[PDB]
Structure formats: structure tokens, C-alpha cells
Design a protein around this ligand. Structure first.
Ligand SMILES: Nc1ncnc2c1ncn2[C@@H]1O[C@H](CSCC[C@H](N)C(=O)O)[C@@H](O)[C@H]1O
Ligand SMILES: [Zn+2]
Lengths: 180, 8
């Protein structure tokens, strides 16, 4: 009797390759291909939460690197002046604070990370990582995220009080009603 | 509004 498997007995078995951004590797190895991978993983579309949002185009694994919050690192004491300059030119300001003395300015050289909306029940979180003496802000998935789902994280604004309150439209059952 | 650091 003939057997289709007789020639396969010694062959390498194949399966789906796991993306480096998703694997249990040191950060620099995961980060190396984040830019290319992110362009495949996510896109900017109209959102039911607010204006435009970032959405999943292709399943994202739990704990995988989604996208870097790209921009130029500046000192914390430059922000105010920069905000006034942009405001005076009709330019939308986008920044993400790294620590007390450093901030990422995504206004002029940012990417799609700028469009991530807030949610009181998020599916993403963020981390600061150092690669080659350079600080980067990286967004990770808290859970498996599926094609079509909106990516959100918790802005966790310091609780203002009055008035001063900005309403939240995240639509989560556990919504806090205000962004602050 | 500059996204905060306590975010991390
Ligand atoms: N859960 C939420 N509820 C109400 N407004 C939100 C929100 N998440 C983000 N926003 C709005 O988006 C701003 C941050 S920038 C996020 C992208 C924005 N949707 C845009 O189209 O450019 C916030 O200051 C707020 O104005
Ligand atoms: Zn909410």
C-alpha cells in the first residue's frame, strides 16, 4: 500500500509564525519591527466615542505591542511655549508625558497613536522603554483584541471638581461619567 | 491636554 506520509516522516512541520511584537522576547527585539507591524495591525476611522479613533484591522494578541506613541522627546519646561505657538498657528497639539521632566511631542511628527480615545474600561495600556539610549512610549494590549474593535486606554485625568468636568462618552457599564 | 504620566 502507498502512503502519502512516507516522504513526510522526516520533514519539518509547519504552522503559523508568531509575530515578534507578541512574543516573550526582550523589549529591543520586540520593538525592532513594531513600526512595520503596527501599520498592519491598526487604523484610524470614525469613532462612536469621539471624532476619530484607532481600530484593530487584524487580530492582536494579549500583551502584544500595538503601536509606539511617536513624536519628538522634549523637556517638560518647553511644553507651555509650544502649546501657545501651535495655538497661534491653528495647529492641534498632541503630547504624552513620559515623566516629570520629559514629554513626547506628537504634533508635528506623530502617528496614529494620537487617535486613541479614553475609556473607563480600556483594552490597552502604555509603558516607557529605553532602546539604544532613546526613550519610547509603547502601547500594549491588555487582552486579545479582534478586528473591528476600538482600541482605548484610561487617560486617568486628575479629578477636577465643579464644573470643570468633561463628560465621558465611552459607553462602558462602569463608566465614571466624566473624563475627570 | 498633555496625556499624563500616572497613565503608566
Ligand atoms: N471617552 C471619551 N469621552 C468624551 N471625549 C473623548 C473621549 N476619549 C477622547 N475624547 C476626546 O479626544 C481628545 C483626545 S485625542 C483622541 C482622538 C480624538 N478622538 C480626535 O478625533 O482627534 C480628548 O481631549 C477629548 O476631547
Ligand atoms: Zn467612561
Amino acid at each position: 500500500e502507498y502512503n502519502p506520509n512516507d516522504e513526510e516522516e522526516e520533514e519539518v512541520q509547519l504552522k503559523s509564525a508568531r509575530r515578534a511584537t507578541s512574543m516573550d522576547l526582550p523589549m529591543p527585539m520586540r520593538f525592532r519591527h513594531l513600526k512595520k507591524t503596527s501599520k498592519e495591525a491598526v487604523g484610524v476611522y470614525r469613532s462612536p466615542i469621539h471624532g476619530r479613533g484607532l481600530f484593530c484591522k487584524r487580530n492582536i494578541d494579549a500583551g502584544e505591542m500595538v503601536i509606539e506613541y511617536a513624536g519628538n522627546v522634549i523637556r517638560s519646561i518647553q511644553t507651555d511655549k509650544r502649546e501657545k505657538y501651535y495655538d497661534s498657528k491653528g495647529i492641534g497639539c498632541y503630547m504624552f508625558r513620559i515623566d516629570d521632566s520629559e514629554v513626547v511631542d506628537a504634533t508635528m511628527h506623530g502617528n496614529a497613536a494620537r487617535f486613541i480615545n479614553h475609556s473607563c474600561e480600556p483594552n490597552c495600556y502604555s509603558r516607557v522603554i529605553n532602546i539604544d539610549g532613546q526613550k519610547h512610549i509603547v502601547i500594549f494590549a491588555m487582552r486579545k483584541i479582534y478586528r473591528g474593535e476600538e482600541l482605548t486606554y484610561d487617560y486617568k485625568f486628575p479629578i477636577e471638581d465643579a464644573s470643570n468636568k468633561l463628560p465621558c462618552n465611552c459607553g462602558a457599564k462602569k463608566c465614571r461619567k466624566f473624563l475627570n | 491636554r498633555t496625556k499624563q504620566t500616572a497613565r503608566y
